[PDB]
Amino acid sequence: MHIEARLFEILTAFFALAAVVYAVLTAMFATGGVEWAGTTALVLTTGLTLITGTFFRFVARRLDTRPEDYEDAEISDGAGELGFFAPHSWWPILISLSFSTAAVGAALWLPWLIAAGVAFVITSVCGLVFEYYWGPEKH
Amino acid sequence: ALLLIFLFWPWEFKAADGESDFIYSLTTPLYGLTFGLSILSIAIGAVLYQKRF
């Protein structure tokens, strides 16, 4: 993919420019020196876009043309078998209930509720991860 | 371990605020922890034997 990488490179360039400009303009002309709270956010949003753009760049350099990236193409090119898309599942609502229990146990300071919520989150996430890998029962 | 704990552990009531015992407060938890865990291990071994042999 060539255009996504270019988008992220544009964003990273602008963010780095803005971060450096803000840092050096608040080093002077400011009440107490460098501002130290917007500077950090700016360098690390630069780092975010940089990470994403670099990953996309490597994947693009390690890839041959794709029917999506390619113009000139027809629908007989993508004829094949896509991945695995999960049909019906009921684990998400249980995960959300467990996380909400832990959150309300953290709002009102109740340690037992926090412990129960964490245990339920571990259980529900385990159920979600193993859903399509449990084998038949051994009897 | 249950037998040894029951025989040789300080069990008498010692509570006060001068000599914080903390050894007496662990006397019943140890009884339970040894007894229940021993019999649970026996049960699990039996279930495994039935399931695999």
Binding site: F85, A86, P92, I95, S96, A103 | -
Partner: protein, 115 residues
């Protein structure tokens, strides 16, 4: 918002209080900005993005339902401060710096708000 307006007409405190008015504008701002707009964005997205790009489904189909249920239960948690005898959160929508401390604003509605 209608409660707020009907109090703001006719100078004098006719039927509300100061605490109740503060809670009203706080919860109005919070609900209208975070429990109606940000999720309606993803509502329209889930409706018509895969159709527009010509795809059969979204990338991760169970993360979708997880997101919806998280939204719903977080909203219900934050709103359920009105059944507390002290009321909901009473600072602004923006929760300025020392007013949301433990000394000022000591109720149990701010905790539910945050979580």
């Amino acid at each position: 918002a209608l409660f707020m307006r009907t109090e703001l007409a006719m100078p004098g405190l006719q039927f509300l209080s100061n605490e109740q008015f503060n809670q009203l504008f706080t919860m109005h701002g919070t609900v209208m900005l975070l429990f109606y707009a940000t999720p309606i964005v993803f509502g329209f997205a889930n409706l018509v993005l895969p159709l527009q790009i010509g795809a059969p489904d979204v990338a991760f189909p169970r993360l979708n339902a997880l997101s919806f249920w998280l939204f719903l239960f977080g909203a219900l948690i934050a709103i359920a401060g009105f059944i507390t005898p002290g009321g909901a959160a009473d600072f602004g929508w923006t929760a300025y710096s020392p007013l949301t401390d433990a000394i000022h604003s000591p109720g149990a509605g701010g905790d539910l708000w945050i979580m």
